[PDB]
Amino acid sequence: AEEEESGALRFGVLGPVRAWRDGETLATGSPQQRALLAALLLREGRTATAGELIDALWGEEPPSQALAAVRTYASRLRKVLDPGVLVSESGGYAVRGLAEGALDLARAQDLASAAEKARSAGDLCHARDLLRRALDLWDGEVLAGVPGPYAQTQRVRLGEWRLQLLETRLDMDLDQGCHAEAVSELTALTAAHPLRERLRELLMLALYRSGRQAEALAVYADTRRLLADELGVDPRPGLQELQQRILQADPALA
DNA sequence: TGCGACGGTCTGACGCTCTACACAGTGCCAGGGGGAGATAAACGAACGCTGAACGCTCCGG
């Protein structure tokens, strides 16, 4: 609310496709139109040619004469957004005029870099506040209802980035002395995603000092059974090592 | 025709690499046909919405 300046046009990709024009919404339109606007939004303002956008929306088999289709999608964007916010060069399309804080993705990289800098500087309160602001950026599933295998690619990429971001958040929560909300979040995420080894290692680390041992190794045994049933291999050596040092109960990491 | 000499013609002129690089003085505008590119409509299909309807276990007086 403190960064809501006059004339600000805010764009959002981490949650669904929406536009905020000084507090009032804009109709982003068709799902393919939403995917087109998102594809322009991921490229931080390239002039990207018509064939590349056609491939981004659809992939291997776009209809043959659908170049005029993308043309009229561009017309839709130009009449629903500002005339000058979208400009065309040599047949390519480009959204400019994006200030700081206009895109939630740019704010996400900014907050991640600030958290990394604070971790390098050894600060904890400012980094915790930065990642608290960062976890409020995503709203539900990223890229809600957009077609295209391209959109699937940045969907899985942003999901993986969110996974490492929450891994770092939970890790600093564990090292600074937070366990209750930590184990709550880890249990919720392992309920959501059952086949991540790193989050279950985080479960072991969090429960190891919060006063919980039986269900931690029960969850580990369930992980071993599912990983043997679905993969039939052995887990990472760092895991077995973490369970090992746990077993002799070293109070060094208290 | 035989002679020389006069002449044009033509060719290469051992070998790689450590090295190795680029290149310059004098017109002008209007009219007109294409095609990319923005606009709003439009043909077609399916995607939602209306709860309704088929049918089971159900706690039940």
Swiss-Prot record:
The N-terminal and the C-terminal regions are independently capable of directing actinorhodin production. The keyword Transcription regulation applies. Signal peptide: none annotated. The gene is afsR. Keywords: Activator, Antibiotic biosynthesis, ATP-binding, DNA-binding, Nucleotide-binding, Phosphoprotein, Pigment, Repeat, TPR repeat, Transcription, Transcription regulation, Two-component regulatory system. This is Regulatory protein AfsR. Coiled coil: none annotated. Belongs to the AfsR/DnrI/RedD regulatory family. It comes from the Bacteria. The keyword Repressor does not apply. Global regulatory protein for secondary metabolite formation. Phosphorylated by AfsK. One of its GO terms (molecular function) is ADP binding.
